[PDB]
Amino acid sequence: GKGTPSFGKRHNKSHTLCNRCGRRSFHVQKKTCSSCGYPAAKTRSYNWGAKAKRRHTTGTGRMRYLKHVSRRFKNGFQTGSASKA
Amino acid sequence: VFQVSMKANKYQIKKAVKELYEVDVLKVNTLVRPNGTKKAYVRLTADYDALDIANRIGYI
Amino acid sequence: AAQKSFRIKQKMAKAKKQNRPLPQWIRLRTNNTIRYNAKRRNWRRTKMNI
Amino acid sequence: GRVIRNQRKGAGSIFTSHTRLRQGAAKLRTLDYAERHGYIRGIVKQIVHDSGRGAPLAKVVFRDPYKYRLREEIFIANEGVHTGQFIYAGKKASLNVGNVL
Amino acid sequence: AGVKAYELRTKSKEQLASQLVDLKKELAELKVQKLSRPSLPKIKTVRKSIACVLTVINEQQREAVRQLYKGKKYQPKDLRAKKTRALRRALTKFEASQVTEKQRKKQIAFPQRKYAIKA
RNA sequence: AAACUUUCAACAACGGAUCUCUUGGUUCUCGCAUCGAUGAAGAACGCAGCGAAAUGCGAUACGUAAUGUGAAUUGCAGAAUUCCGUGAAUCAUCGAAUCUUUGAACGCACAUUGCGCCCCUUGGUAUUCCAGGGGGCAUGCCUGUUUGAGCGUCAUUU
RNA sequence: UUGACCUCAAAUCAGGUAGGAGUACCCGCUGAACUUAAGCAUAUCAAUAAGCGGAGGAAAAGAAACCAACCGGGAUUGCCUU
RNA sequence: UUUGGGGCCGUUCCUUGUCUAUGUUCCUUGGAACAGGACGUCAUAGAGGGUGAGAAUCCCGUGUGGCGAGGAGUGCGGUUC
RNA sequence: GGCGAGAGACCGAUAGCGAACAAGUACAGUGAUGGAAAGAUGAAAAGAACUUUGAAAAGAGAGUGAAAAAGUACGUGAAAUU
RNA sequence: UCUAGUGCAGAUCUUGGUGGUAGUAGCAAAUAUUCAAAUGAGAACUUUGAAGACUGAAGUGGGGAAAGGUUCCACGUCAACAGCAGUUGGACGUGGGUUAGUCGAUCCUAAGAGAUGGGGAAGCUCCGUUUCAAAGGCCUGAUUUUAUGCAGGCCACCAUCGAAAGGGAAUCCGGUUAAGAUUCCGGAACCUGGAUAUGGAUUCUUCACGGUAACGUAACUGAAUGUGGAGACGUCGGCGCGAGC
RNA sequence: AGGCCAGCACCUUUGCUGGCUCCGGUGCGCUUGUGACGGCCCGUGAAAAUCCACAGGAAGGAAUAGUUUUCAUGCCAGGUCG
Secondary structure, rough: OOOOOHHHHHHOOOOEOOOOOOOOEEOOOOOEOOOOOOOOOOOOOOOOOHHHHHHHHHOOOOOOOHHHHHHHHOOOOOOOOOOOO | EEEEEEOOOOHHHHHHHHHHOOOEEEEEEEEEEEOOEEEEEEEEOOOOOOOHHHHHOOOO | OOOHHHHHHHHHHHHHHHHOOHHHHHOOOOOOOOOOOOOOOOOOOOOOOO | OOOOOHHHHHHHOOOOOOOOOOOOOOOOOOOHHHHHOOOEEEEEEEOOOOOOOOEEEEEEEEEOOOOOOOOEEEEEEOOOOOOOOOEEEEEOOOOOOOOOO | OOOOHHHHHHHHHHHHHHHHHHHHHHHHHHHHHHOOOOOOOOOHHHHHHHHHHHHHHEEEEEEEEHHHOOOOOOOOOOOOOOOOHHHHOOOOOOHOOOOHHHHHHHHHHHOOOOOOOOO
16 A cells, blocks of 8 residues: 555645745755755755756846846946936 | 734724724724735724714715 | 644635636737636645645 | 664664663762762662663762752662661761762 | 925925825725725825825935035945945045055156157 | 448538748847845735736835926726826836845744844833834954953052 | 053944855866776776856966077967967 | 146047938729839938838838937046146 | 847747747646647727527527638648548 | 758657547446425426435544645526536635634743854865853842942853643633634633732731641731752553543 | 423514423443552653742831731733734
């Protein structure tokens, strides 16, 4: 009964949600995410996990500041305001 | 019966009602509606009348 | 379960607000390519995995 | 070939000692000044069974000479020791059973 | 309809607070009218008017504090320049134009003369 | 002889090839150098008069302000003084702001929307208790300040 | 006694600073095997991939403890070539 | 024998707005003319796109120059202390 | 790689980036990771009033349209198979 | 003329699609259904009533943990699903719904995990959890420039996380809804924390009396420090007693 | 209160009024809790928080008035998540 009845015995989550990635990879008994490396400082990445990088990298989100960075570089990082020509 | 921020608590609700509606409030029972919101059942003293102040507000 | 956590309940509420069909005025708008919802989710068929 | 049992035994996740019911480590009183220049009296208050150990233990109690305090020790009981029993530890102590000469 | 930032700027602080509480009460009225009714956009006009009011107030306070900290160093970390981490951590044109008096002498005595070559 | 099987054609079907398209991709070239403790990348949850998503945004929530244009948005509804004008608009531009809870994440924690300490202030007849609001408390290191410790050590006391 | 010094410390002390991300190129460490050898162990794949640390718009290098043996040249990088 | 520093206007660089010619004449077909035909125009503009079908000549643009606005700035040209 | 521009004896929706579309999406897996399919009505919705049969869906007429041999199971509409 | 991703019958080829087999195998465990009425276009199955049967309290009953997530309840409703059917449904559509001082989490620590100091490691990070560390806060106040210093005094564990079944402060009845209730309504209680007034008690023998005693009481000063108890505990046997049945 | 019954009323919100709700017995009975004992062990069968008491005697207080708030009564509040 290594198959079906054991799958019936299967009901306790090894993994739950993580607060840095939100992916349900936070091993409770180790206290680590299997995807971001929480609660470590760094973010978990590998150059064999190219797809993983591509999935979790810059630009898959809002870039709440970084789009405006390039706009602002174009305008030369200016202070002040307009003058009502 | 009010719909309420998830950041709020019973002291806040009681004081806010006393201010906005010029009433006194006996007790407060809150819950989280599974649409994500908070709901508050707010019981006053027997002095005031909830019907009166609700059809004063302009809902009924 | 009954004894649950607020995060779970939060995600559940969001799911419940997602689980309903398209608006037909969106079906009416200009240049529209949407006919139906395809992010639709039913407890019998697929689980959230949370 | 595998690593074998005697080698796994040294990491010891499951081979560690089951150290719950053990009343403490059965060490003698510390050798401070009273022991190495005179003697000092304590009292065997209670003999008990230590788990994993076939020899019993004797919760002895002394007094602190430096403070109003009652530092309790754990001795391994010898044959003849009983409750309420005065234990004399030190250098000029007398040679009877239970003493720490 | 709604409100106008220029006349708000002419108005004073307490006038703005009164405007704000009025708008908020009106918006609560509008939400009960909304649950009674099918549709109501006047609530959206109200929303953006409240937003502009709070914006104006913020600008007034920040300008007060700017002209308070004026002409001295150590102004705070939300009235300073935002430019970028690296540019803030960079040198100044002063600190980068600093020289040894030695190199200043060598400059002044032997600078790149502007010459030309035909005859 | 029919029926049935098979074959061919016409019409109808299943199905989605062929043809013709094309806001995409790929490759080459040119040019510029711009993330973050002043809190990033990312994540979660939430915001529209009527939306689930996408895109946008953060309780000032498909956006505010400011500037420019110059009268639209549009699926519906509504709005009109907003039209010879400090002014429409899912407009463009963008120099002032907001920037929920998190995250290098920084009061201590975290499978808890958990538990504290300090300052200012308000109420409850309250330095102490309770609650509300506002502001704060990470670590390592640098320079400097103040308070120090050590017969490590100097002098000078009587 | 009082005041210095030396060294070591503490403060929610005054001011600042580093951390993380991205990583095509760049500086370094670390470090394989499949493979080729018609086998295979040196060797080769490779002073490579993976892993780790750290930067910029370029980096690194760089004004010779150099090349040379000439009638001598003259920082560095790079292209052709050798 | 030889020397320094600031201002201004220009100029350079960046960003960027706006203006800058020519047929929608006739006939046939067609649902529609951008097609065919006839007659013409501009062209330092016949590149490209759009519009009911192959559109230089309908629209945006292109080409040509022009007129501005805000920034960087010592690169330098004149002027001033 | 990032930001912005231009080009091609390139691919033309089983091709070309995995992704021309609400694609790193739905979905699977405890998890690391894996990872799709799916473009075209018509110039314009003018997207079929009205009558009739039917419980209705739909049908037959009518009508729109240049064309329903264009009816959201929509450009054309092969074959297998029927 | 140039140039190629240039010609398919095959590759247990790839992707998609389609067939014959074939209206076939088969839809057969769990003792079992029937009569009428109503609805509706339409009833073997929906609803009601009547009958016959079953589970038979170690149950097909009533409530929960893990998990699931809104399936809960209602109204409408049958294109797809419910391997027949369908007027029904855990389906489709639209809404509504989960009320706590006393139930739990939160607190405690267990096995254990894991920072700091320090030490290793090229380095991601490893060891270790009181360690070769200068590792802190508790109380009375003293002043009445005045807030909180200075007066003292005290102590030295020396992070934190870890159980919704362990330990643990305290709530019961009746009623009520479409769906909730030890939560809401009514009534009747208890606990913690913080304020405070009266009564009561006690005292001129200044901090209580009685009792031979076991010990009793409406209360009836008591800091630092220290000792002790409860928390705090196996299993089986038979006996007694109690509660409910 | 709740439960069992009776009576009189009405489109109806619909009730309204009355009574009873008593006294016992048994048991190796079932389940469960508990008490005092016994038996078993080379097995003797968690910890901490928290609470209380005691020893001790710092300190503080009465008389024209004090001391006490572990006695009684009285006042306020009791969050967050499920």
